[PDB]
Write a protein that binds this ligand. Sequence first.
Ligand SMILES: O=C(O)C(=O)Nc1sc2c(c1C(=O)O)CCSC2
Length: 296
Amino acid sequence: MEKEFEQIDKSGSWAAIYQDIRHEASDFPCRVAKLPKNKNRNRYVNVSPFDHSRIKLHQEDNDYINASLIKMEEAQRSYILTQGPLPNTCGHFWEMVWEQKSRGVVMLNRVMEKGSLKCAQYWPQKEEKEMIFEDTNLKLTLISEDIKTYYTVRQLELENLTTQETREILHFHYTTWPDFGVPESPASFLNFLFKVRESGSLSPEHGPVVVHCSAGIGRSGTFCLADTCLLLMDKRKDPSSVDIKKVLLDMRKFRCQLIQTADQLRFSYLAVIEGAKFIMGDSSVQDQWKELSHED
Ligand SMILES: O=C(O)C(=O)Nc1sc2c(c1C(=O)O)CCSC2
């Protein structure tokens, strides 16, 4: 990837490669997304889940959410990628987290960005003010939170009000990754990815992690592409056998248009190439990312 990276950079060809990926990517129907009744369930008219990998809500009324299951078979990790919840679909989002048995929610965007409300405020910002989502009968409380300078970790309690079963959900909120943008550095992104990893939420005893940005494609695609490249590499301890563009194409079978610009593609190569130092047995790089990232 690293010889590949410098051949791309050297000849200024990131947009054409990105363009090429774009022409190779799958396209499957998104007919349920586009039903008239689901119009207000999609944030963006042109970003829909394919029918074959969409998450169905376990409810008879209307089972649709804008969300897909990215099942990475070789890597043996799955993720749910979803749009930032809308004001009428926060109760569906939480219904999805409960039914799917997810332990973690990775949020890569802010509620407000570039002057616009890119996502609903779907979680409580304070402990005394729980949310009840009456359409899906679910209660959520802020148990606490750890605010760093570029991310915050929250612990949430999700109650299914129908059984009174309770689960803890960890929320990993990256607050300084710009829409259509890249993280400040490979260090700080890697520091963030490894916080999520260490917490256990990626672990196969749990449902798939839920990753969202505002559309569930650009920042989320970038997050997942890095994670999975690094997992692949880990399982074989063989960096040279991971084909990043080929992993992004496999992920694009399950949701359209994963990774939104050519600099996000380029950052993913940066992230995986740096992350490999750690996968290949230099644990010291991890606490270096931590220093560089200025987390406190
Ligand atoms: O949130 C991201 O990282 C991302 O993919 N966002 C996307 S992808 C996308 C859009 C947006 C957006 O937020 O405006 C606007 C419609 S075109 C494709």
